[PDB]
Amino acid sequence: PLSETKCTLKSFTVEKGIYQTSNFRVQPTESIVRFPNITNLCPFDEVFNATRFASVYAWNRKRISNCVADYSVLYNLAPFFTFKCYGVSPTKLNDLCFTNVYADSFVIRGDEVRQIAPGQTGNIADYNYKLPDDFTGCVIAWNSNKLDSKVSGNYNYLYRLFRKSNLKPFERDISTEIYQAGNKPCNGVAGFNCYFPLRSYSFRPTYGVGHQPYRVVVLSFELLHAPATVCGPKKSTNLVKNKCVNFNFNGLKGTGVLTESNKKFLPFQQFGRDIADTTDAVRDPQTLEILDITPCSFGGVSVITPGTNTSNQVAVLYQGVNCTEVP
């Protein structure tokens, strides 16, 4: 602390007197990360865990709003065939809150795995279902050979080869109408210049690579100016009282200690501030408790010393801090 006087005053000769150098501050050690409860789970079992399905034009959306969906146990397990998407990682979907979540179920052939892409053209995606260019989600295939398959084929659901024009995304066309190539009217049946688009499924587990049933769920993600009612889970830490720590909350980041607060609070209130707009009281997200936020213990350091040609003896003054609070 004699050398703390020489660094602040920028001189090697210290005159006789009292000089203020720096401020003592207790540094934080641990960190508290909090996240709320996983309660009110959402029915995601109508797509992934569902027994039945539909065809590629017959697909039924599942409306997911105002609930907590758990994708976190699926990413740590992952019995997934192929997941491919563009620009948004599927492992980064768990900590983000999304406003509009839509999900569907449709089963495709094994040559149609490359026919599901953002911006995909062909005889499959343009005539049945394709992904738009502004689509921010990601798609996960799942192997249907242990549940959804059938011996020798599936004759219950059929798919459409052809369509008279190109079909937009966010469209469901259930129509049975025959594609007309020429000027001859087809009248609902095949004939001259008429192709019959309806083909049965070839799906069996004992056939080859080029046709296999695959459960394909498209997760439609949309972020609007409304706040998000659907969030994914996040692993949190414990709660430490009466120690100097860093704060990581949902709506707050700071540094201080946690003490018991006697102030009353609102049930819709997370945090509240004082005159300086600094948060002195916070609600715990998991359970109902109010904690008084106080900053860590600080004080000024004054150095009492004689001259450098007289003595090296150092007397240290701690201003505002009692002697029991020095350790």
Binding site: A276, P295, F298, G300, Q319, G320
Partner: peptide, 22 residues
């Protein structure tokens, strides 16, 4: 007739020692 980083320096001469000058 509450600490944001602003402190109040105490005075040197106390008010009991002012009255012994008085």
């Amino acid at each position: 007739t509450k600490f944001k980083g602003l402190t109040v320096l105490p005075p040197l001469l106390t008010d009991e020692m002012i009255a012994q000058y008085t």
